[PDB]
Hints:
The structure is cut from a larger assembly and holds 3 copies of chain A. Chain A is mostly helical and 48 residues long.
Amino acid sequence: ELRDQQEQVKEDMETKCFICGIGSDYFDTTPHGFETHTLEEHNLANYM
Amino acid sequence: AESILEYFRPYLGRIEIMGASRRIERIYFEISETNRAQWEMPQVKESKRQFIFDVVNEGGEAEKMELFVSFCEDTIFEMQIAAQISEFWGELEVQRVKFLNYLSRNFYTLKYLALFLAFAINFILLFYKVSDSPPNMVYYFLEESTGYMEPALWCLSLLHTLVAFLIIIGYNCLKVPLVIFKREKELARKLEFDGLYITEQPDVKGQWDRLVLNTPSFPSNYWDKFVKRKVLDKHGDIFGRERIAELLGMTWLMSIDVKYQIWKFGVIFTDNSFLYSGWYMVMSLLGHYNNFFFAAHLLDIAMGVKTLRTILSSVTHNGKQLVMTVGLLAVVVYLYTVVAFNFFRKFYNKSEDEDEPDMKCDDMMTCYLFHMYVGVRAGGGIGDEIEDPAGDEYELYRVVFDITFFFFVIVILLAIIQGLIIDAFGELRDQQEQVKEDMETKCFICGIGSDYFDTTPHGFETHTLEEHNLANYMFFLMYLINKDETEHTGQESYVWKMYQERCWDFFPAGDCFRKQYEDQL
Amino acid sequence: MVMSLLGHYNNFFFAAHLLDIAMGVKTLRTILSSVTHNGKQLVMTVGLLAVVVYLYTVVAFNFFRKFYNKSEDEDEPDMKCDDMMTCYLFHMYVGVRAGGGIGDEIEDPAGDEYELYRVVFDITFFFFVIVILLAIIQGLIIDAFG
Ligand SMILES: Nc1ncnc2c1ncn2[C@@H]1O[C@H](COP(=O)(O)OP(=O)(O)OP(=O)(O)O)[C@@H](O)[C@H]1O
Ligand SMILES: Nc1ncnc2c1ncn2[C@@H]1O[C@H](COP(=O)(O)OP(=O)(O)OP(=O)(O)O)[C@@H](O)[C@H]1O
Ligand SMILES: Cn1c(=O)c2c(ncn2C)n(C)c1=O
Ligand SMILES: [Ca+2]
Ligand SMILES: [Zn+2]
Ligand SMILES: [Zn+2]
């Protein structure tokens, strides 16, 4: 179980977020909704 | 028009595309009588599933159908090689053609026949005996009745090693001509869409491939023969249009390419499925020398039925953690040694007789060897092969040296190591489970799952045998191939030109006709 | 029934009827149903633990025959491994039931001439055929039940 945890993080990132709320059932409609909406808009490194 | 509809049920394709001012659409196109035939057949269907398994595993949702059409460029290859085999010195040709051709059709049963020979050379060999006086050391056979078996082992060893030498012949004519296709058209892409050898630099498999570009036969079997003239233009004007044309170089034996043979052996000798089928042979020669070496061939039962492979595959894949643990159980057995070597040397006496004391622990290169050979195999800790501390002078201290062994190095650690493995096995196979699903509920061309075509009856078996059928897009890709190019119709071009530029946007990506026509239908 | 006739003949055959406790209460049926349903993998494993015990035999039969001596008295040497139809039988009857690998019913290689080589013939048994394999086979079953 310690290691499955290391697994759930690995996800949580992929599907959802970590600045806004939403997951990926919204930027799934357009192509490449992930790599736009997390290297263009809500990029968790710009805010440093 | 009932009968003509039902006569042309299996020949009418149907494919949904996207484009031409941002909408969806329906394309209708003719299926031949032979692409429907040689896709229903098992050597190929196989691959299908295969692709299906892994790309649901390590694909995201982005790079998926960069892999699809990377795959449909293959099955339309060996499909073109399946027909390559289907049914004085010149007659050498017809034999040479006929022999290997009708051979390699036979192939898979030609191997399975190999196995069953190994289940006789072992059983028949499971009768030996040795003795002081022959019929020094002498080895004969037992076979007390049936005194013709001992001959049979001579015609069941010159009939095996032959059947090894076939499979090496069969392989090199049926399967390698893909595994240089799937290299060459992995290079030419990475020499004409971001120019590996010409504006960046090399992964050894990169470096090994410099040996070929000079050669005059680089596209040997990958369709093309122009890529060369295609990259004396794209990345060729900025660089020296005399400089690059250097880099590329712009009966049989009288004109055999001296180079590019040495390359072609490059990638085969590194391909595992070939490099096994040598070992499987070269033992089978060594048999004749010692004759038990035909026991080794018995190990093929791991590379056999599905579960058995997983057995060994399991044992490996978690090897990151596993070896790095056993690299710790070999350490925390050291520490006890240093403790034992300093204080409790008096007890490690295996001498059953007091005239010749034995004293297993003096040289620490032994007392470390004694612990890791009878102190982790006794299931009762180390205090099972020692005198006991009933008497005195350390008893208490000694009885905590032991029962801290037992706990650490026989209850925690040996539990871990069975553990890793067994549960790893369990998990490879649950994966095989999640694929099984992912298909059923959702998709694999569009996005949506089945919470949309659940409302209507049979939403699955319509929307995956009528609209988004993941097999039509290989019939299109090879129906497109051969229409004479000046009559590609109104959609059938804009795909075909969106294809030789690799834009993968003629794939619905979350829509169906029943998707914007919800209100009109 | 037809057991229950045979009873009259030998009269212990009414012990067989006692097996109905598997086709009874729910959990007990699952017990046996479990044991079967995964039989695809299971038999095809035990069909491998009977093999990788062979390989050791061939190794033992060629080099280490000197140790397999169960003769408690030196007047009648016994030598369990001469005929490989025995040394393969000796391994799979007291070398997977001793819980300590095969080097538990043998002389030990303290003395010489192969000691190092011998102490890796054993501790590769212990690991493979008593830590991996016998773990697998309890495993399949118990979790299948689950
Ligand atoms: N909502 C998000 N916000 C910020 N980043 C995200 C979000 N979702 C996914 N990501 C990014 O997907 C990235 C993949 O990892 P990335 O390549 O960028 O560097 P990394 O995490 O340190 O791993 P690596 O070093 O191997 O590259 C994550 O680092 C993470 O930054
Ligand atoms: N989105 C989808 N696209 C394409 N096919 C799908 C989709 N969802 C389900 N399927 C199909 O459900 C099918 C069931 O398997 P199918 O009978 O057609 O051949 P198979 O997969 O090779 O198995 P089998 O040989 O036993 O028949 C899958 O092959 C798969 O093609
Ligand atoms: C795109 N494409 C192919 O991918 C292909 C081909 N012949 C074989 N290959 C594989 N042709 C003629 C083609 O236009
Ligand atoms: Ca036209
Ligand atoms: Zn966000
Ligand atoms: Zn779909």
